[PDB]
Structure formats: structure tokens, C-alpha cells
Amino acid sequence: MKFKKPPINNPSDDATIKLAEAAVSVSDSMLEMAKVEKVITPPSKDNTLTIPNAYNLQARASVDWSGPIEELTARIAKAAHFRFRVLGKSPSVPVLISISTKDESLAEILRDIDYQAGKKASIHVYPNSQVVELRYAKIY
Amino acid sequence: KFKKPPINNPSDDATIKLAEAAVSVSDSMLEMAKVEKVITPPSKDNTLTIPNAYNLQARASVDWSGPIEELTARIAKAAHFRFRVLGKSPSVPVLISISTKDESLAEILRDIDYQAGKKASIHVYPNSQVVELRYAK
Amino acid sequence: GKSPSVPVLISISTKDESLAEILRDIDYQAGKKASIHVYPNSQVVELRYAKIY
Amino acid sequence: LNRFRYEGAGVVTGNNLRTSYLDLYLANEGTTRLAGNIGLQKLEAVGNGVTQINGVSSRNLQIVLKGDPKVLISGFVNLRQLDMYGKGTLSLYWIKSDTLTIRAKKAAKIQLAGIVNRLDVELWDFAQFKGKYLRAQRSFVKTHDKSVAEISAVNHQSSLATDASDIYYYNLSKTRADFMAFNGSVLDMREWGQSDLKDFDRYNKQFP
Amino acid sequence: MYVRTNLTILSPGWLASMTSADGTHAYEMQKSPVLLVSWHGKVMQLKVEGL
Amino acid sequence: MYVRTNLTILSPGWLASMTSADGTHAYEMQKSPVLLVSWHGKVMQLKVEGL
Amino acid sequence: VPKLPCRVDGACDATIIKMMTDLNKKGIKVASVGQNYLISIPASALFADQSPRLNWASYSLLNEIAAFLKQFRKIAITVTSYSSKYVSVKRERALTLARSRVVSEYLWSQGVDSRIIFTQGLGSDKPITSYTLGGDRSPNARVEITFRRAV
Amino acid sequence: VPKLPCRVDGACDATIIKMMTDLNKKGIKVASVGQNYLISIPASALFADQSPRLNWASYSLLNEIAAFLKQFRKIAITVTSYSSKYVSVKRERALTLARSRVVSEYLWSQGVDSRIIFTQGLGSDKPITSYTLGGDRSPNARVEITFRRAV
Amino acid sequence: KIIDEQLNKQARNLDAIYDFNSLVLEHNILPPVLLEGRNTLNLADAQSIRISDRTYKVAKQAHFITTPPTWRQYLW
Amino acid sequence: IIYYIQAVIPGRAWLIGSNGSTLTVREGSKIPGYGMVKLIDSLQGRILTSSGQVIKFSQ
Amino acid sequence: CFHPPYNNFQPDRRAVKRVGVDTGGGTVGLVASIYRDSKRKIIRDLQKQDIQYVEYGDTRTLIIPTDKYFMFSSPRLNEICYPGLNNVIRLLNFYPQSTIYVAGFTDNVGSRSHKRKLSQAQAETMMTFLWANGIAAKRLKAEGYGDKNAISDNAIIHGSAQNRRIEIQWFTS
């Protein structure tokens, strides 16, 4: 004789309600901008050709890091047992990235690192020589 | 006997909506950076390859931050290779900044070329063991 | 058309009519501000604002 | 040439025979070479015979087997149903169909490759289903004790293992669901050294 | 405010900075009771008083 | 009086008005304690206190 | 004085000592030298035989080991999976990879504030016992957790 | 602050629960899902055989369901009337149209707080069961009221 | 106190969703801030109105930045 | 135009072109627009031919 | 005696163990068993859980909350509410001839393709789960829609929580 409905949770907070109500419109705006930009400029290639995948690079990982990139790439080189190398100089303005994902390939993690780097630094791998080498933007 | 759920599960509906929004905006931003990012082909990559000669595999602890001409002549003399230059020294000298304790001198020269970029370049002949510093016009 | 900034306000009080006459009635009530057309061959009800000024 | 039933240690060789349909019922070592282009719908081998057919193309075919044959057919067949209850081997070159039912009881060595829109697999015991190079839109596989199956699912994959049952997929299905009861196993057995291997996404990241 | 450390200070905006040859960073910036750095990929707060 | 909502104002008039891309409405009128809105075809009066 | 915490929260070193000795009496290998801590578990107390299915009671031991691992300050943990020789190389390589993936996912679900989880499995390439009579009961099949305490 | 109304007048959730349970045991189907509510009444509880006339006993039930519907806050109401095949198609459609019109008129003229009420009927054109043995006693002969609770 | 506790409770999705650091241009410069307006009408007085379809305003100009901001100087 | 791969046995393969045309190819075969296939792969879905292109599956 | 992992996909045997521990009267165990396996107490236990059961005419429908029964943003089936799933199996064993339509629904935020993929994946998950319990593969049809038809508005928080759902419809003949 009782009557219920399916979704029942622990109670909420109105400030969290207002935060989510901002966040939905923010998400829609960002989706709008990204869709229009992708439409107006068509890409040509991708970083898969720059970064292939070889054996021992198929170990898995899950991460949460929010710092300068150098400790992160040194740790991933120590995982891969690869020769780690730098090129150029890190500028006085540091490069900070934030990755919080779940169970990815090392190669896809590195491609995400390059994409979030964008026009500040670039990454390359010589797999046969087993080397991960970065290069900062040699400009300014 | 007992299995627990994850601790910071989004139990609350506001948390559900918020985390979903975060996932959506993360994938959108990664998409936009991907569609705007400029890459380079690994065939047209104007970079110095490894010269893979025998003598270039010594360990050196090198600190320098200044002109490049004395540095390349000094590492050539350390390598017992001949060295010459093709081009003219400009008024403002080419400047570099390299400090390391143990690398290959060959990839050190590769880093010299990479910091040089446009105005300078380097060739190496291993048969007649020479290093050539090529200036730009 | 373009919805103008000044809203177009319609008050209706009527019981037990048909849809077509409701449509014709409110199109008459709008008058010089808008127009309604119906394409029943394509099942499309279309309205238009007034291109004025 | 309508119905051909044979027993008793025969060798028949033929090529360039044109027919709409004929029914073969072979027994007791029929060594057959058929290098023609023949449509047919039914075939029966009683047991303990080896038969290789080069070229069969029909709109339809229904086949069951009873003994221990060693058969292989070349061509394209829109098969529907296949049941194996003995100690049989089978291999087809191409299949272009939509609905496939497979029942395996005792010992089957089946080698198929082609395009099937919907595949159902039942394996009971000592089944060795090598269905690699066989792309499927929908795959539904149920394996009981000591059954090994090799699948190549593309889009929708459903897998169940009771115990001591090996199920090896070979492609990244856009939807994967797997279950094991007592001692089952769902595994990839991929290569990992390819230049263009892709990882999972948020839609198929199922943890066994 | 003048601060010597070896972490990477993020939040309140630093006016100028320099580095040693060994990873020690030197910052000078406005007055704030609070700093916000990155340690090892974890963000940390820093309480400063005594102004 | 500076009023933001997503309703439609009726009675006192206003001097200026603008609308967002989502249907939000922003208005500009003189001092008044009350407002009129046709919310969903139904007339409502809104109380504004503390003028 | 109450404005600064006197210790890292959720830490009592007596309780840490007690749970370490409890795990050693339970039969779980715990070892350390300086800052490098390693713990080793045979796979027979977790999985089915040559299988990536998990017993229900094993979640309790997973809860206990997560409660131990919440104590220290950490950065990167590495979990490796090891097995015996069964059919191929691919079979046990995939088995170790799957087992490492499962234990990594549930560990990440639990609240251990490490920045990095590395998982890898190698199958049967580096055994630690020449006596190879047993199958999955033999202690060469195992899982290892390695990390370094920091400051 | 205290002069503002604490609740919507003429409303109590306990009264809502009690009257919907009474309707449910009375035999009229009550259906609640999300914010959209459905109430369906069999036709022979309201009319005589194939006839667009109201029996005098039906007005008590009509008053009851009107007092139920006034409790919520609505914008749009929709009523549908359905029947069985008798002679024609348009004859049954016209019967449903008349029935829905009559009940819509009475519900409007009673003090319910709707804004817009649509009425239409079709008859046998959208059945709900394969049991067509009964005539106007058949359970598919029905009237449905649907609305959405607005905030 | 409770809302500062809740904002510390939900942490990583907040700086995840408010990525300033991808918004930075090539030369470490904060992009400037723009505002929109749809369907403007203002009446000045009798016999005097002014309408416009879309309006846009620059709020604050672009400049150099030594660090990307966070949400803490907006929400704490 | 392009082609696509359908099923691969070790030695022979099934191919579908852009216009829906079908082919079954040997170890050595001739395809106009692409020439002569030198070798195939059965573990991988790649075809090595005289024109230097590599065929793949649908995405 | 039992296993929490879905009783290892065996035929679940609750009543015989119940009458065994009841005899440890026999008629008391019998009346307890016929109270427990009765459909009314099954529906009431589903109402004690968070599952919505609706019968109307001959079409029978079931509604399951995805946020409760699933790990977040995932096609992973959450393992906590296995008593609810056992109740689901025991109820749906009753009509072994009706075909099954199953569908999934999500809210209104994000990429439409992403919503469609998530709903179709969850639909295939539930379909596979039912397929793993003695149901022939021709008896099912799965579909995952996006936000094509809500039951409550997604601009208010509780309705937005209500909107995503799992829908199970089945017929009679």
C-alpha cells in the first residue's frame, strides 16, 4: 500500500545545487565553442604517427598529478625502462598540467600529455633505441 | 564476508550532475586542443640525427652558457675530429645554455642544433672525421 | 521572422471549440503583428512575425 | 545427379558439373574430389571418411553430421544451422550469412571465416571452436565445462563461461559483457606489438 | 614578500623570480598570509603570519 | 530598479531591456514595490520590499 | 597548537606494528629495507585456478590491506603479477595483466592517496623457486606490491 | 516572512495518499510515474450501454475525482475516451468525442484549476488487450486523464 | 564553516572544470573578457526609442600573467 | 577509389571495393589501381602491394 | 549452500534451505515458503527495494534506477544490489513465453552521441545478464535512447535525477 519512486539518495546542499546549475550551462557553452571550432577548421593528421607503440609500453596505469611535467615524465620513463632525454630549456614560466584518468595505455597517456601541452612543448619516442625525449618550444 | 563500495562515490544527485559535467567538459576541451594542435611529420622533421660514430660515446660533464663556436671547436678537439665553418659570424653572436653531467656528446651536438634552430646548423662527416658549422644567409 | 523585444500579449477565454477556429481566432487577435499558415499536406503549422520599421 | 548415397571405399573425381541441387550421403571412406561449381542444400557423412570439395556456391545449405568425418568445402554458403555430436572436423573458406546457430557436444574442430550478422554458440564439452577471422555484428557464446572458443567480435559481444572454459576474443568490441561462474576465463590473447593498436574507451571498459 | 624555497608556487601571482643551478627557487611578490604550491603533483596550502 | 529573471513583466513599464541567449531577461525601470508577471498564462503579483 | 596537526591523520604506529604482525601471522609476506616496502601474496588466496574470477571472502582481505595502505604518505605504487606455466606465453601474460588490472581498480576505488598506480604482469618469466611441483598452489604464482615511503 | 503562505492552500499529502488509495481500491486505476500522472476509469462505471449519457450515481464519483484533481498544480490536461467496435469506425469515434466532451465540460465548470484542457477520443483504434469477449463490460472501454505536475 | 567544508570536500572536479591554463595564448597572456547582449531596446523619452539586435563589449584588456589563476580567489 | 578487407585466411583474402565490387585474392594477385600484392598478413589486417599502400578494415 | 556472486549462475534454491532450517514444523516451513515465493510478497519486497513495478491491462513494466544500480558513468554493473537482481530473476521467471523489450534512458547534458552510446551499452549489459539466465536469444530486443522522452523535467534537480532509468516492458501473448 506504500508508494515510492526509484531515485532516492542521501540529502544534498543548495550551494552544490547552484554549483551544478552553473556547471551545466558552462558545459553546454564549452561544447558549443568546441563544436564550432572543429567545424570551421578541419584537421589533417594526428600524433599517432609521431608516437607509435612498442612492447613493454603496454603496462597500465592510473594517475592524479597536478604539477610541472618533468617529474611526471621521469617517472613514466622509469616505468618504461627507457632512456629519458630533454631538449631545449624550460622557460621561467612553468608548464602545468592535470591528468585524472583510469586504466589507460602509456602511449595514450603520452599522447594526452602532448595534446595538453599544445604549443609549449612536444614529445617524441624512438622505440627501437628505447628513448623518450621531450623538447621545449624553441621560440621567444 | 564483506565488500565495501568506493569511498567517494557520487551518491548525491548534485554530485552526480557535477561529475558528469566535469567529464563532458574535459572531453570537449581535449577535443578542441586536438583540433587546433600543430604536429610535425617524422619524415620532414628538420632535425639532426644521431651520427652513430665510434668515438662519440664518451661521458662528459659540461656546463656552458654563451657562444657556440668555441664550444663546438672544443668538443671537436675532445673528439679528435677536424672542424670547420661555412658562413659568416653575425654581429650578435649565437648564444646557447647547456648544463649536464653525463650524456652522449653526439646528442649534445643534436641539442646544439636544436637550440640553434634557424640561423645555424651542423653536418658531420664520419669518413673524413670532420664537423662543419653551416651558417644561414 | 524576428521576435521583437516588445512582447505580444494575447488574452483568451473560450470553451469547447475546434483547433482551426482557435487558430483563426488568435490570428485575428494578433492582427498586424504576426500571421499564421497551415500546410496540412505536409502537416506543418507555421507562424511569422511582422517585418515592420 | 539428384541423390548420391555411397558406401564401401570409393574414389570419385569430377569437375565442371553443373546442377541446381543434389544430396550427398557418403559412408565408408569416400575419397571425393569435386572441382566444379555446385549449389546444394543437404549433405550427410555417416562416419570415418575424408572429403575435400573445391567450389560450392548456394543460396542455402543445411548440414548435420553423425560419425567422425574429415571434410572441407570451398566457396560461399549462406548456412543457417550446424550441429556436431561426434568427433568431427570442418573448415569453410567463406561464409556470407546473417543467422548462425552452432551446437557442439563432444569433439568438434571447426574452422570458419566470413561475415555473419548474428551468431549463437553452444559448447558442451571438449569443444574446440576456432572461429577466428569471422567478423560478427552480434555474438552470444555459452560455454560449459572444458570448452575453448576463439571469437572475433566487432560490435556487440556476450560471453558466459561455467568452469574450465577458455574464451579468447580477438577484436575490440564496442560493447563487451562477460561472466564466469566457477573456473571460467575470458581473455584477449592479442599481439601488443602492432603499430596501430588502440585502447579502450569509457563505453567498453569492463573489468573481468 | 621575499621567499626562498624549492617548490613551485602557484596562486597569488609572483612579481619576479630566479633559480639556482640546483633547483632552488627564489620569489618576490605581494603580501599575502597564504601561499599555494605544488609538491609532487599534490596541491598544498601554506600559512604565513607575523606581518 | 535592476531586475533579472526569466519571466515576462507586465504592469509598470520599463526603460531598458535585454535578453540573454538562454531566455534570461534583464530590465530597467523606476522605483516600485510590486511587479506583474504572466508566468504560464496565469497572472501573478510579485512583492518587492526594502525599497 | 591546535591550529597545526601534531601527526598525519589516521596514523598510530603501534596500530601499524600490530597489523603488520597480524598479516605475518596470517601468512602474507611483509618486508622492508629503509624506505622501500614490499608485500607479497600468493594467488591461491585470491583467485580461482588460472582464472580471473574473485572469491567473495577475498574482498575482506582486500579491505584489510587497503586499511593498512591508507597509513603512509605515498607517491607511486607498483603492483606486479606473477604466475606459473600453463599453456602458452600469451595465456599467463594476459592472466597476470587482468589480475593486476582488477586489483588496481579496486585499490583505486579505495581511498589510498597515491598519485600513481602502475600495474604490470609478467606471467612466468621470473620465478623464485626451482621446486615447481605445484600448479597454482605453488608459491611462485604471486602478486607483489612495491612502494617507497617519502618523508 | 511570517505573513507569507507556508504551503499551497487546500493541500495535504496525507489527504492525497488517502484519496488515491481509496480510488485504487474503488477500481479506477491510479498510475504515478515521475511527474506525469495517469488516471483511468472503465466506461460502464459511468455510462449506460453505448450511450453518451450520465447516470445520476456517477456524479459522486465525478465530484470525488474533481476534488482530487484540484489538489495539484497543473498547466495542461488531456482526456481520452476509448471503446469497442460496434457498427462503424466514425460512429465509435463520435461516441468517444461526445463522452470526452461531456466530462471535460463538467470538470471545467466545477472548480478545478486547469488552464488548458484538450479532449479527443478514438474508440477501438488503440486497444490495450486481446480479450474482446465483453461488450461495454470489456475493460478496454475506458477514459484516461493525463497531466504533468508543474513544480 | 559548513560551506568551506563542502568546497574542500568536492575538490578535484572544480579545478578540473575550471581550467584556466588551457585558455592561455602563445606568449603566456591571459585572453581578454567579452560580453554579449541579445535584442536590446531602450526608450529614451517620447518619440524616441533605440533598438539593436546584438551588442558586444570588451570588459578588461589582455595582459601578461605570471601564473594561471584558480577558483580560490573567486569562491573561498 | 578504395577497398576494404572482409575476411583473411592465411594465403587468400576477401575484398570489397568502393563501388561494392567483390574480389577474392591469392598470395599473388593483380588489382588495378594498386598493382601486385607481394605479401599479406593473417595476424594483422594489412595488405602489402606494389603501389605501397596498406589496406585496413572499416571504422 | 549459497553464493553472493549470483549463486554462480545455478538455479537458485532458497525454499528448500528455508524449509530445512524450519524443520530444524514442516507445515510451518511450507507456509513460510509459500508466503515467500508468492508474487505479492515478491512485489512488496521490490517496493522495499527501489524498483518500480507497474501492471496495467496486460502490458507489464519495470523501472530500475541506474544511479543506484550502476557504478557512475560506467557500463559496469554494480554488485551491491544482488538481492534486488535475484528478486528480478525470480519474478521474471513466471512468464516464459512473452518477448522482452528493454530500453535505457539518460539525462540531457553532454554529447548526444555519448548519451546514445552509454544507453545502448547499458541496455546490452542488462540484456546479456538476462541472457545468462536461461533465456533464448530470440526472446529479447534491446534499445538505448538518449533524452527522447522524459517523464520529468531536467531543469530541476530531482527530475534530472528521475530522468535516467532502465525500462523493461513485456507482453502477454
Author numbering:
A (entry chain GD): 23 to 162
B (entry chain Gd): 24 to 160
C (entry chain FD): 110 to 162
D (entry chain GM): 113 to 320
E (entry chain HH), F (entry chain GH): 311 to 361
G (entry chain GK), H (entry chain FK): 38 to 188
I (entry chain BC): 76 to 151
J (entry chain Gf): 208 to 266
What does the paper say about this structure?
Legionella pneumophila is an opportunistic pathogen that causes the potentially fatal pneumonia known as Legionnaires’ disease. The Dot/Icm T4SS has as many as 300 protein substrates, a striking contrast to the H. pylori Cag and B. pertussis Ptl T4SSs, each of which transports only one virulence factor.
Indeed, a model of the C-terminal domain of DotG generated in Swiss Model using VirB10 as a template fits into the resolved dome density. Based on the structure of DotG modeled within the PR (residues 791–824) and the homology model fit into the dome density (consisting approximately of residues 857–1046), we hypothesize that DotG extends from the PR to the dome, though a physical connection between the two structures is not observed. (A) Two DotC were observed in the maps that were reconstructed during 3D variability analysis, one which contains an N-terminal extension (DotCLong) and one which does not (DotCshort). In contrast, the N-terminal extension of DotC was modeled as two relatively large helices positioned near DotG and bridging adjacent asymmetric units. Notably, this portion of DotC was only observed in either four or five of the 13 copies of DotC observed in each map.
